[PDB]
């Protein structure tokens, strides 16, 4: 009965994870040989770094430009920075650039997307200069089309490296993110590890480990078949040979009518994968970013991401025709991403309606064991020993991503997006109260009752000691990322 549904759930969740782990290891071994067969003094691809932002933490927008200026790479052509919106509020976002690079803060009168002549000469006859554009804002799509146009008219630019405004690239980031574009002729985009430096909050650490487990495992498994479904948001390198062609249907999109712009990165990757080309991901391209801390902000972020996924996983499924035999993985990944959420929902509904202590303690223990195995592998790969905080990521998932998935599904057609989340919390609480008041008895002579009570008590103790370990670590300042431990010092003096 419950065995078909507990054991099959455990196998369904763990076998795919083991497959993804082994595929990521294969991809890392593949990339190490490429890196090894490379001359030390290698400059071949002339990149042009592109930044788009909007009121991004004056100090952090300084750290981003400083990191790009401190990045080691022989052949960097220029730096295109596009700042959304023109106002006395974005002038003090051009000034933080002007104090880092130069005084070429331009301001074209019209948005280069809405403007008829889409080509260059946007008050820009200078190709050997570091430029910053102040244009009216229409989203990251319109403010990145301007950058794409800027770093195209130079015939000596062959690739473009896209970054977000609140990112701090390591020194050997551009060098290791642009190499795979020169490794093979069918690669038109490379991903990059996007680490998280803000881990001073309980929601800001489990999500950090989720980013780790969604890049270095999830996005590493896909790169083995060279079909990465979504290039890294903050850090990513694109070949101009494909950007110059996909920039036109990228910012033209209509889904069902009304045109709206969210989840632009996955759209770029989707348009690259819909032309039969390949995308890989390299773990030697570390980049740092912050994370949302308030639960409501994280739920909003995840509902936007789920909105983006629910309209383009269809296209990722439908473009597997263009890819060859490698590309059945592209369908299996999407089918899994759907049926796993569906199976989790069904399991919760079943064990919440048909109340049974031995059919609830068993599920809790099996889920905890699977999460412990995943966290153990994450700890081994990262050599961090702080990766065992991933055990608590199940709570963050169940209480924030699932309401986000439901809300995105409902809007696919305060009360805008939080009513569904509040109703979901109320439903979970009602199920728990019904289960605890329905089985309100004590029978110590029953071995099954003893097993159920012992299991639930041991699980509660395990969760409590994990939380106590986290609290102690925060007290002694042990969870703080080595980057954050230095930004919190450079912040005091400024």
């Amino acid at each position, epitope marked *: 009965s419950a065995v078909w549904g507990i054991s099959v759930y455990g196998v369904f969740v763990l076998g795919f994870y083991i497959a993804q782990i082994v595929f990521s290891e294969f991809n890392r071994m593949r990339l190490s040989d490429w890196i090894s067969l490379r001359p030390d003094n290698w400059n071949a691809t002339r990149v042009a770094v592109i930044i788009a932002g909007y009121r991004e933490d004056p100090f952090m927008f300084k750290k981003c430009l400083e990191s790009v200026r401190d990045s*080691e790479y022989g052949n960097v052509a220029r730096l295109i920075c596009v700042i959304d919106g023109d106002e006395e509020e974005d002038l003090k976002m051009a000034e933080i650039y002007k104090q880092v690079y130069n005084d070429n803060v331009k301001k074209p009168g019209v948005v280069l997307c809405e403007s008829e002549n889409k080509n260059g000469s946007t008050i820009d006859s200078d190709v050997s200069k570091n430029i910053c554009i102040l244009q009216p804002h229409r989203g990251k799509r319109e403010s990145l089309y301007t950058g794409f146009q800027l770093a195209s008219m130079d015939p000596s630019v062959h690739a473009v490296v896209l970054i977000d405004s609140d990112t701090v690239l390591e020194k050997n980031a551009i060098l290791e993110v642009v190499y795979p574009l020169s490794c093979d002729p069918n690669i038109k985009a490379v991903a990059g590890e996007c680490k998280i430096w803000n881990t001073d909050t309980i929601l800001s650490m489990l999500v950090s480990w989720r980013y780790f487990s969604a890049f270095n495992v999830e996005r590493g498994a896909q790169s083995l078949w060279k079909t990465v479904q979504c290039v890294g948001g903050p850090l990513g390198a694109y070949t101009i040979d494909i950007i110059n062609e996909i920039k036109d249907p990228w910012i033209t999109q209509t889904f069902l009518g009304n045109k709206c712009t969210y989840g632009d990165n996955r759209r770029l990757t989707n348009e690259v994968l819909m032309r039969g080309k390949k995308i890989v991901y390299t773990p030697f391209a570390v980049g740092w970013s912050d994370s949302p801390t308030n639960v409501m902000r994280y739920i909003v972020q995840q509902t936007r991401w789920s909105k983006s996924w629910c309209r383009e996983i269809w296209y990722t499924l439908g473009s597997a025709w263009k890819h060859g035999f490698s590309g059945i993985y592209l369908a299996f990944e999407c089918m899994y991403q759907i049926m796993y959420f569906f199976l989790v929902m069904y399991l919760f509904s079943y064990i919440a309606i048909k109340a049974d202590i031995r059919a609830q303690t068993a599920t809790v223990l099996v889920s905890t064991l699977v999460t412990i195995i995943k966290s153990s592998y994450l700890a081994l790969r990262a050599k961090n020993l702080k990766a065992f905080y991933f055990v608590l990521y199940t709570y963050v998932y169940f209480f924030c991503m699932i309401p986000a998935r439901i809300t995105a599904m409902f809007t696919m057609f305060w009360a805008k997006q939080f009513l569904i989340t509040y109703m979901w919390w109320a439903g979970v609480l009602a199920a728990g109260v019904y289960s605890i008041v329905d089985n309100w008895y004590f029978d110590w002579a029953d071995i099954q009752y003893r097993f159920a009570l012992v299991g639930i008590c041991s699980y509660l103790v395990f969760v409590s000691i994990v939380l106590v370990i986290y609290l102690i670590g925060k007290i002694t300042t042990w969870n703080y990322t080595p980057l954050q431990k230095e930004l919190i010092e450079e912040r005091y003096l400024h």
Partner: nanobody
Amino acid sequence: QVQLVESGGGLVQAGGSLRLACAASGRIFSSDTLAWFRRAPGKEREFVAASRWSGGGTDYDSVKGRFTFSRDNTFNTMCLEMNSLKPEDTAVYYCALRTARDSYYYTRNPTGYDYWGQGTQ
């Protein structure tokens, strides 16, 4: 801002060995080109050898294979080693920094360098 102070130089006769150091106060950013410029007595500034702070090597004619760069990148200083000196190789040496701010284009023109040191010897 970035202040460059260079030391070394002295008596030169026949084929001699010299070592000129230049210490920098500020941040060099591992993308700025640091170069050694030469000024002969009663002559315009000439070029000797440049290098990006990220580890790129170049030199000039009549000195290739005789001088060598070495950037510590940890002590915020550079050292130029001189080999097989010439009697005609008498001049004052400056160490100059060029910021990759307006452009990431490497140029040999002495006027492209924002900050300059003080001549020695």
